């Protein structure tokens, strides 16, 4: 381990071995000094115009962190295509992480003149929250992950966290965490860091779409032996009185047939069209938003439980806050136009999951008698019911991979709503920080903590290797399947490539459900 010796090589590749695929990606990173080496209490109350739904109390820290919770951090577009076009499923098995070729640079600023040089003896500090003692900030769809394109140099995100709050104030249970309290490895140029991790057992992601629907599992050609109430009143003319008539469900009465299952849970969202002219002329994104109520404040149930984005022929419709939406390259942070973002679609699950913008179904609302007509009620919120079956939200090339399951007494189907794998012991948080280097101190002793430091930052490479287990497709479907494919005809540029300006871009969201499977 010396100044003149590399401490690691560039490992970027993918190998397919059978029921496994191993991805490996390396990137060059840059880490500045955050918070001026300080920890700062940050808060936001209800003063000014800040609403109560957005209050918070927490801290910003001088630390940065590595994040690769995004599929494109590991799969190239072509690899993603190889995965989704041929496998009914897949899942993470184990990973290796490495930090190397570290270099700490210090910048001198005198008379407009700026010079940067190495500080051969400075160190960075690194450690993993292997015992999950820090607030788990990963799994919240934050920016700062390794770039999709291998040639892009990225900046390391700053670590910050939240605790309990009451307005802009802290409460008795509010917790303060000092990351310097943890043992951490100190590396100088020449030193490297690495660790291994094994994923817990988790189900394969459903990278397939159903080629059958819950309400169409019977034999088209045979009647049931079971009967259903088919008539409640006579029909012979005008002397119509009450009676009781029963019939057997059959090919023409599939909606009446007795069935064994029920569609998945529902939490109805407001519908909105991509054809603005068809929408009400008001600003309802928030006022008509589907939300949950937690201790006084409201949050969008975004994207909320997995529901079909729209029913047959209505591609223009989508749940106001019930789908993942990515931005196109350079889309504005605020009020970006529809043509600057990319809406995803969980259309593939219409097959088992209720459509996100409609009722779950209908229930009786009273007791009918001869003097009281029967009444019905529309169900727009339907929790788990015995016999329900459903699918989870799909995952995307540019979407999240996993999330830490909250440590609670209970929960229900812990599949992270934004999509992905829910893990009790997810990949550990990897914290990194440039060690503060005092600028000359006074010549006579003083109690005060130093606050004058040499200006510096660090850079180096990072590698992440993940082994994935594949669940091969075993279909007897005779006719060809749907497959993700590149466009055929000429185009100004190549999809999933760089610009004349060297800018890489992801033209569209790529899901995972192309192959089909029976129910």
The footprint of Na ion (CB under 5 A) covers 486, 495
Number of residues located near a second copy, criterion CB under 8 A: 175
Long-range contacts of 377-383 (CB under 8 A, 24+ apart): 379/266, 380/266, 380/268, 381/266, 381/267, 381/268, 382/265, 382/266, 382/267, 382/354, 383/265
Name the β-bridge partners of 468: 21, 92
Determine, following the binding rule CB under 8 A, whether residue 228 of this chain makes contact with a second copy: yes
Determine, following the binding rule CB under 8 A, whether residue 47 of this chain makes contact with a second copy: no
Determine, following the binding rule CB under 8 A, whether residue 215 of this chain makes contact with a second copy: yes
Binding a second copy (rule: CB under 8 A), the pick from 99, 324, 431, 464 is 324
Query: Tokens in use for 89?
Result: 């499923």
Q: Calculate the alpha carbon distances from 58 to 15, 66, 165, 166, 181 in Å.
A: 43, 20, 8, 12, 18
Residue 495 partner contact from a second copy, Na ion, none using kind-dependent CB cut-offs of 5 to 8 Å: Na ion
Residue 128 partner contact from Na ion, a second copy, none using kind-dependent CB cut-offs of 5 to 8 Å: none
Residue 333 partner contact from Na ion, a second copy, none using kind-dependent CB cut-offs of 5 to 8 Å: a second copy
Residue 493 burial (C-beta neighbours within 10 Å; 0-12, 13-18, 19+) = exposed
- Interface map 174-193 toward a second copy (x if CB under 8 A): xx------------------
Binding a second copy (rule: CB under 8 A), the pick from 372, 443, 479, 487 is 443
143's CB contacts (< 8 A; 6+ apart) are: 157
DSSP designation for 435 = P
Determine, following the binding rule CB under 8 A, whether residue 434 of this chain makes contact with a second copy: no
Site for a second copy, residues 473 to 492, rule: CB under 8 A: none
Site for a second copy, residues 56 to 85, rule: CB under 8 A: 56, 58-60
Return the range that interacts with a second copy (CB under 8 A); candidates 272-280, 463-471, 479-487, 508-516: 272-280
Determine, following the binding rule CB under 8 A, whether residue 140 of this chain makes contact with a second copy: yes
- What is the Cα Rg of the chain in Å? 28
Identify which of residues 82 and 425 has a Cβ nearer to a second copy in the complex: 425
Residue 486 partner contact from Na ion, a second copy, none using kind-dependent CB cut-offs of 5 to 8 Å: Na ion
Identify which of residues 180 and 495 has a Cβ nearer to Na ion in the complex: 495
Residue 361 marked as a ligand binder: no
For residues 494 and 219, give the distance between their C-alpha atoms in angstroms, rounded to a whole number.
Answer: 47
Determine, following the binding rule CB under 8 A, whether residue 92 of this chain makes contact with a second copy: no
Residue 498 partner contact from Na ion, a second copy, none using kind-dependent CB cut-offs of 5 to 8 Å: none
DSSP designation for 438 = B
Identify which of residues 82 and 150 has a Cβ nearer to a second copy in the complex: 150
Name the β-bridge partners of 228: 247
Query: Tokens in use for 129?
Result: 């929250």
Q: How far is the CB of 479 from a second copy (least distance, A)?
A: 37
Decide: 84 and 484 in contact? Cβ < 8 Å: yes
Determine, following the binding rule CB under 8 A, whether residue 388 of this chain makes contact with a second copy: no
Query: Tokens in use for 239?
Result: 């002397």
Query: Tokens in use for 152?
Result: 């892009």
Residue 60 partner contact from a second copy, Na ion, none using kind-dependent CB cut-offs of 5 to 8 Å: a second copy
Identify which of residues 81 and 257 has a Cβ nearer to Na ion in the complex: 81
SS3 state at 350: helix
DSSP designation for 54 = G
Residue 387 marked as a ligand binder: no
For residues 432 and 104, give the distance between their C-alpha atoms in angstroms, rounded to a whole number.
Answer: 13
Site for a second copy, residues 101 to 130, rule: CB under 8 A: 101, 103, 105, 107, 116
| Residue carrying the six token digits 């209970």 | 410
Residue 276 partner contact from a second copy, Na ion, none using kind-dependent CB cut-offs of 5 to 8 Å: a second copy
Binding a second copy (rule: CB under 8 A), the pick from 23, 302, 352, 353 is 302
Q: How far is the CB of 400 from a second copy (least distance, A)?
A: 8
Q: Where are the extended beta strands (E) located within 251-304?
A: 262-263, 266-267, 271-273, 291-294, 297-300
Determine, following the binding rule CB under 8 A, whether residue 200 of this chain makes contact with a second copy: no
Asked if residue 303 has a cis previous peptide bond (ω within 30° of 0), the answer is yes
For residues 62 and 35, give the distance between their C-alpha atoms in angstroms, rounded to a whole number.
Answer: 5
DSSP designation for 455 = -
Q: How far is the CB of 384 from a second copy (least distance, A)?
A: 9
Binding a second copy (rule: CB under 8 A), the pick from 219, 371, 474, 479 is 219
Residue 283 burial (C-beta neighbours within 10 Å; 0-12, 13-18, 19+) = exposed
Determine, following the binding rule CB under 8 A, whether residue 222 of this chain makes contact with a second copy: yes
**What residues are designated binding site?**
415, 422
**What residues are designated binding site for AMP?**
415, 422
């Amino acid at each position: 381990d010396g100044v003149g010796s590399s401490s690691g090589n560039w490992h970027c590749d993918s190998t397919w071995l059978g029921d496994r695929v191993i991805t490996t990606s390396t990137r060059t990173w840059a880490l500045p000094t955050y918070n001026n080496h300080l920890y700062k209490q940050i808060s936001n109350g209800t003063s000014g115009g800040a609403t109560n739904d957005n209050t918070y109390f927490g801290y910003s820290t001088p630390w940065g962190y590595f994040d690769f919770n995004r599929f494109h951090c590991h799969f190239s577009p072509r690899d993603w295509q190889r995965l989704i076009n041929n496998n009914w499923g897949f899942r993470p098995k184990r990973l290796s992480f490495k930090l190397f070729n570290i270099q700490v640079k210090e910048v001198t600023q005198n008379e407009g003149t700026k010079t940067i040089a190495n500080n051969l003896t400075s160190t960075i500090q690194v450690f993993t929250d292997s015992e999950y003692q820090l607030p788990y900030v990963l799994g919240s769809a934050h920016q700062g992950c390794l770039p999709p394109f291998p040639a892009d140099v990225f900046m390391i995100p700053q670590y910050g966290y939240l605790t309990l709050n009451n307005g802009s104030q802290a409460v008795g249970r509010s917790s303060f965490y000092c990351l310097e309290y943890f043992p951490s490895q100190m590396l100088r140029t020449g030193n490297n860091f690495q660790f291994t991790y094994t994923f817990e057992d988790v189900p394969f992601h459903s990278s397939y779409a159903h080629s059958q629907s819950l309400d169409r599992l019977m034999n088209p050609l045979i009647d049931q032996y079971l009967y259903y109430l088919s008539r409640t009143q006579t029909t012979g003319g005008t002397a119509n009185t009450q009676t009781l008539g029963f019939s057997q469900g059959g090919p023409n009465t599939m909606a009446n047939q007795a069935k064994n299952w029920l569609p998945g849970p529902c939490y109805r969202q407001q519908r909105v069209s991509t054809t603005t002219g068809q929408n009400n002329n008001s600003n309802f994104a928030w006022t008509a938003g589907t939300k949950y109520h937690l201790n006084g404040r409201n949050s969008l149930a975004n994207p909320g439980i997995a529901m079909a984005t729209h029913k047959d022929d209505e591609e223009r419709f989508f749940p106001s806050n019930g789908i993942l939406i990515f931005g196109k390259q350079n889309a504005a942070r605020d009020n970006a136009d529809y043509s600057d973002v990319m809406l995803t679609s969980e259309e593939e699950i219409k097959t088992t999951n209720p459509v996100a913008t409609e009722e779950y179904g209908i229930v009786a609302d009273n007791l009918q008698q001869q003097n009281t007509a029967p009444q019905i009620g529309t169900v727009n919120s339907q929790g788990a019911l015995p016999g329900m079956v459903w699918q989870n939200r799909d995952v995307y090339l540019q979407g999240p991979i996993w999330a830490k399951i909250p440590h609670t007494d209970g929960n229900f189907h812990p599949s992270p709503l934004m999509g992905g794998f829910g893990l009790k012991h997810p990949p550990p948080q990897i914290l990194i920080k440039n060690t503060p280097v005092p600028a000359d101190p006074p010549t006579t002793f003083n109690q005060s903590k130093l606050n004058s430091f040499i200006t510096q930052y660090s850079t180096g490479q990072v590698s992440v290797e993940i082994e994935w287990e594949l669940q091969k497709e075993n279909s007897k479907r005779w006719n060809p399947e749907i497959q993700y494919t590149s466009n055929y005809y000429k185009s100004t540029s190549v999809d999933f490539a760089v610009n004349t300006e060297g800018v890489y871009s992801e033209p569209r969201p790529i899901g995972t459900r192309y192959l089909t499977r029976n129910l």
